[PDB]
């Protein structure tokens, strides 16, 4: 069992893992969707009430145990070892749409090594339609179908959806994003190649730079006219929109998926953790300093959109129309071309969004090779290294559908699916079995023995009411809105939605499986039946 | 309706310049490639040059782009193709075309009339 | 650069025939899923006229006798029904990155 090294690595790779590149485009969008400056409330009450006791769940279960994810159960909970595969699953779904967008945003950082950036200008061969949304004029040209030059530039040229028809016409096969994707996959090979000495001397460097770039970012966009009613607007509050359960979902679901619990990842992160280390300042640490993040990078992105609202002399809240991924590579393709320093600032922001991608992948990668090789302690001599290039290899399969010229609409899918209600559902069952099987008073005995201290009534109360009661609620909540995405001109048919559901599906079923499996696994009948599948087994 | 103008015949002596004219309206002038045909008695069509009036970025085929000069005033939106140290081979009809957008492949939908540079 | 070869260099078609041009580039033209090839029209004294954009899309004052064709480094426009009007020198030309450049000339006589 080997461990961090120095203490620092654990909090950075956690640190890294928590830097999502999900929410540098999301947050602040979906902040000014709900309340805006009265969102902040909702916010932090959700992520005392419900993210910060699963954090620190997760940390303490991981470092208790020194196990990855798949065998925490056998020395938890035994009937319950199928959520390992459904991280597995999950890891596997988020590794391929989200190096897919790491791919985009490294064609996009290749594209951002010349003096003139090519999205700035609409003479270019991709650019077909309109191009009528610019900046810095003072005329009124404007109709209701056209399209800005940045946008002809992300879906013709970078995605080239324009060659496809939606997910019924998947043709085609970009080589640009293949070569790309392939130094991304790489990349992270040779960053999970050995173990986590190197990952976390890696962590070290990547996870460092997107606070610097982030600082710079922001002092630089403070200095540009028009930032006032962009931060103004991102901090109006509606405290009358907060009346409707709504936002209440709305700002739990992001700060769960903020910090990101039920990954399995923080386990692995943990594992490699002495027992004598205190995870009560790591969590707090980690948790805050997200926060922090989080309301960094949506105070800089408000400052640039009402830069570019006030350049464009029109009303607010009329340029979020994007969302998803194409927000950052459109409105901030648009404002970086219209900044005095262009190639500068276009390679920082990518280059930070390239590190933002790789804390993450790092991260969900090592937690599932982990994951895989405490399960099987015959595989440790050599299996490492193979086994990484195995799971690269999986990746790279299951990124290749999404790597055509119209795979931006799966990418688009398996970003709203499989990452809904089921690592939701995923963190809600490990919750569920850790302080209803395992016992509250067990994991608080095992938590006062590992740190010193037992944790106060305040999280053996939460633990027990509130966490797996808030996450059914979301589940609950979410279930009960059907989905409706649309991506640019198209509108996803009712196959779509059935293939979604599906995909998100198929990791979860995994637990029942196993379920079904260890209780017919052994003869007898079914009380004392669950009697051995709930008691675990001495070593 | 889209019409292009453009200037009238001219003769240059051997050892000086021209500046051809092209007056293009009704669309987008900022938002359309012009390019310049040149065309000898008798042979075939010869590519000049392009220029975008949105930026005023010019290209070019050949060995043409260090003897011909394209401009694209906005105000006026007029397009200028200047000549330097023209010679008896050069003694052609230069037309000039505007481009279509990208998915119609830059097509030369409408040409203008020529002018016999002698 | 592209270099484009025009075959035959002069066709005689007489009426009512279906006419055969074959332009040949150097590379390839398709970038984004487009052909970027044009067919011209240049009668003797008149300016050319466009016939085809992107190899396979007509322009508006173009009958629907016209029909081009080919994708990728061949190229092909048919005329059929061919028409006394016809007798002119038509050319292929192709919108690359940088360079444009025409063909040969095809002289389509009677």
């Known amino acids: 069992r080997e461990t961090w090294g120095k203490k620092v690595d654990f909090l950075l790779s956690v640190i890294g893992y928590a830097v999502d590149l999900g929410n540098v485009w999301r947050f602040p969008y979906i902040c000014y969707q709900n309340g805006g400056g009265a969102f902040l409330l909702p916010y932090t009450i959700m992520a005392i009430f419900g993210g910060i006791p699963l954090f620190y769940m997760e940390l303490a279960l991981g470092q208790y145990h020194r196990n990855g994810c798949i065998s925490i159960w056998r020395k938890i909970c035994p009937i319950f070892k199928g959520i390992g595969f459904a991280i597995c699953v999950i890891a596997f779904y988020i590794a391929s749409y989200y190096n897919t967008i790491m791919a985009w945003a490294l064609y996009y950082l290749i594209s951002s090594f010349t003096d003139q950036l090519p999205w700035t200008s609409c003479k270019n061969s991709w650019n077909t339609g309109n191009c009528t949304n610019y900046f810095s004029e003072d005329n009124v040209t404007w109709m209701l179908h056209s399209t800005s030059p940045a946008e002809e530039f992300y879906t013709r040229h970078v995605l080239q959806i324009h060659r496809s028809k939606g997910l019924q016409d998947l043709g085609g096969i970009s080589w640009q994003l293949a070569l790309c994707i392939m130094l991304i996959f790489t990349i992270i090979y040779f960053s999970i190649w050995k173990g986590v000495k190197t990952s976390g001397k890696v962590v070290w460097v990547t996870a460092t730079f997107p606070y610097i770039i982030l600082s710079i970012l922001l002092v630089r966009g403070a200095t540009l006219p028009g930032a006032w009613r962009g931060v103004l607007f991102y901090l109006k509050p509606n405290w009358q929109k907060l009346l409707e359960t709504g936002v209440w979902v709305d700002a739990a679901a992001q700060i769960f998926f903020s910090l990101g619990p039920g990954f399995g990842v923080l386990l692995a992160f943990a594992s490699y953790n002495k027992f004598n280390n205190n995870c009560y300042q790591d969590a707090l640490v980690t948790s805050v300093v997200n926060c922090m993040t989080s309301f960094v990078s949506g105070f800089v992105i408000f400052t640039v959109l009402g830069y570019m609202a006030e350049m464009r002399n029109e009303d607010v809240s009329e340029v979020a129309k994007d969302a998803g991924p194409s927000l950052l590579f459109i409105t901030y393709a648009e404002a970086i071309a219209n900044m005095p320093a262009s190639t500068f600032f276009a390679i920082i922001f990518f280059l930070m969004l390239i590190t933002l991608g790789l804390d993450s992948t790092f991260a969900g990668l090592e937690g599932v090779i982990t994951a895989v090789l405490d399960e099987f302690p015959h595989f440790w001599s050599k299996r490492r290294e193979w086994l990484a290039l195995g799971v690269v290899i999986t990746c790279f399969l299951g990124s290749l559908i999404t790597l055509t010229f119209g795979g931006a609409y799966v990418v688009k899918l398996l970003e709203e699916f499989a990452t809904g209600p089921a690592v939701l559902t995923v963190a809600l069952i490990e919750a569920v079995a850790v302080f209803w099987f395992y016992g509250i008073t067990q994991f608080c005995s095992d938590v006062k023995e590992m740190l010193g201290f037992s944790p106060g009534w305040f999280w053996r109360i939460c633990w027990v009411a509130i966490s797996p009661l808030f996450l059914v609620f979301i589940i609950c909540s979410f279930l009960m809105s059907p989905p409706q995405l649309w991506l640019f001109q198209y509108n996803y048919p009712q196959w779509s939605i059935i293939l979604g559901y599906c995909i998100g599906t198929s990791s979860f079923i995994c637990i029942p499986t196993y379920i079904t499996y260890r209780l017919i696994i052994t003869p007898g009948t079914l009380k004392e039946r669950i009697v051995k599948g709930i008691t675990p087994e001495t070593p | 309706q889209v019409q292009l103008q453009q200037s009238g015949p001219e003769l240059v002596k051997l050892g000086a310049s021209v500046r051809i004219s092209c007056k293009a309206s009704g669309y987008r002038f900022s938002y359309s490639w012009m390019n310049w045909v040149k065309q000898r008695p008798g042979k075939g069509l010869e590519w000049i040059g392009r220029?975008?009036?949105?930026?005023?970025?010019?290209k070019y085929s050949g060995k043409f782009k260090g003897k011909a000069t394209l401009t694209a005033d906005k105000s006026s939106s007029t397009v200028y193709m200047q000549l330097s140290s023209l010679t008896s081979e050069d003694s052609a009809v230069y037309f000039c075309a505007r481009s279509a957008y990208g998915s119609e492949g830059f097509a030369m939908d409408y040409w203008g009339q020529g002018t016999s540079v002698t | 650069d592209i270099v484009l070869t025009q075959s035959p260099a002069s066709l005689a078609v007489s009426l009512g025939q279906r006419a055969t041009i074959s332009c040949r580039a150097s590379?390839?033209?398709?970038?984004?899923?487009?052909?970027?090839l044009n067919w011209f029209q240049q009668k003797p004294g008149q300016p050319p006229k466009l016939l085809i954009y992107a190899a396979s899309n007509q322009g508006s004052g173009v009958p629907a006798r016209f029909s081009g064709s080919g994708s990728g480094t061949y190229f092909s426009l048919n005329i059929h029904p061919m028409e006394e009007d016809d007798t002119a020198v038509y050319f292929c030309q192709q919108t690359k990155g940088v360079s444009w450049t025409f063909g040969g000339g095809t002289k389509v006589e009677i």
């Open positions: 590379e390839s033209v398709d970038n984004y899923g487009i052909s970027f």
């Open positions: 220029i975008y009036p949105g930026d005023g970025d010019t």
